[PDB]
């Protein structure tokens, strides 16, 4: 073990407060659209030791970590590891990150409201949209 004089403590990558005071494997879990599994596969394709902490990375290491998660297909990442599969508009395999998650979710919510479907109305009314029973549950969030 070594004492890193060059040790960045708190990372700010893709507009997210990333904690470098953790394992690199579970620090990328903190961003939206990336959990433990995708971060683990990305870092294994990046050939980074899981023993290494998140704040111990070099500049080129951080850059290649960012470039791997953007376009996953050429980096030996399968098509079923992605947040969204073939979408309604483009039908393109793409992994969704923290910034795209919010506006993709709100356009998903607003897609069914123009459609005027059962799920769109259930989302608009705040009720459960998955056929769930809220006769006895769902008290939280209601009056």
């Amino acid at each position: 073990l070594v004492i890193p004089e060059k040790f960045q403590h708190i990372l700010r990558v893709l507009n997210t407060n990333i904690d470098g005071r953790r394992k690199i494997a579970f620090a990328i879990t903190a961003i939206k659209g990336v959990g433990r599994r995708y971060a683990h596969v990305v870092l294994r394709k990046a050939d980074i030791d899981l023993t290494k902490r998140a704040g111990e990375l070099t500049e080129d290491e951080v850059e290649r970590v960012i470039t791997i998660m953007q376009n996953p297909r050429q980096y030996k990442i399968p098509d079923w590891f992605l947040n969204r599969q073939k979408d309604v508009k483009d039908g393109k395999y793409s992994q969704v990150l923290a910034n795209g998650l919010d506006n993709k979710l709100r356009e998903d919510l607003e897609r069914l409201k123009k459609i005027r479907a059962h799920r769109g109305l259930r989302h608009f009314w705040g009720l459960r949209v998955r056929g769930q029973h809220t006769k006895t549950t769902g008290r939280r969030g209601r009056t």
Partner: peptide, 8 residues
């Protein structure tokens, strides 16, 4: 998580 000057 890592060492300090006084810790080592």
């Amino acid at each position: 998580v890592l060492f300090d000057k006084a810790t080592y």
